[PDB]
Amino acid sequence: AGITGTWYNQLGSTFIVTAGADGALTGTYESAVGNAESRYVLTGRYDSAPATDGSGTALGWTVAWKNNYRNAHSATTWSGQYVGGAEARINTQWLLTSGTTEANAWKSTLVGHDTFTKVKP
Template identity: 35%
Template sequence: MQSKHLRLTLLLALGTFCASRPGPAPNLAGCWTNQLGSTVSIEVAEDGTLRGTYTSQVSSTGDQVKGDLIGYQQMFNQPTFGFAVKWTTESVRGSVTVWTGQMFNTHGHQTLMTMWLLRNNTETIGNNWSATRTGQDVFRHCGVKCESTEGSGDLGSQWKCDSSVGA
């Protein structure tokens, strides 16, 4: 009888241990949109390296600008990350922006809370004081891919999450 209780106790302990083990860490793969309608598309390698593209709806020229993204993600339940964007659109070429932040899963929604630094290229050291800007962005997960929709109106209306994938 004591042997049966011991086995039952061990089975319950093992079941509790297995049930409490976390699943694979979430990652930043997919499409994300911020509060201004800018969109980032990210692919994540097994080692946490990030690659992708960023399309900003806001710029000093007032035009949509694009850039190449590279960065890293720490593989935790609510991962931390950092990425840099080298702007490739002619009007902002020479500028680089870096973001750092953390992904949060709240009420079934994935959100990236970030801070950023934008460095503009400057011709002289005298202009150094105004060449770096700071700010924050909140991104929401849109799904697997980003989709461009032509249109006009509010800043966020030109880029939408693809409605064919789960938001």
């Protein structure tokens, strides 16, 4: 699948990803330091039998920003596709939802994008 490994976004984040034979994505977000206080679980899914016509591999994953040290009361989901080859990428759009009161729910979800590469920018 080409997805298992360490991935870097363009803005100082690291993700350790494992792609299981069944379509499972597992792993962690890690800080640049790699310390336990900044480590969070990721879980998601990917297409384990992509098209053989040059198409990318659809996927998504979530991190809830709680570990045994910190809780931001929020969760990010990334949706995108893996593209293999010499310039392998995961191109994604993300949504970050924060836990809010009902009055503030309308402004609970931020949107953005991330591009993941196998080496640093």
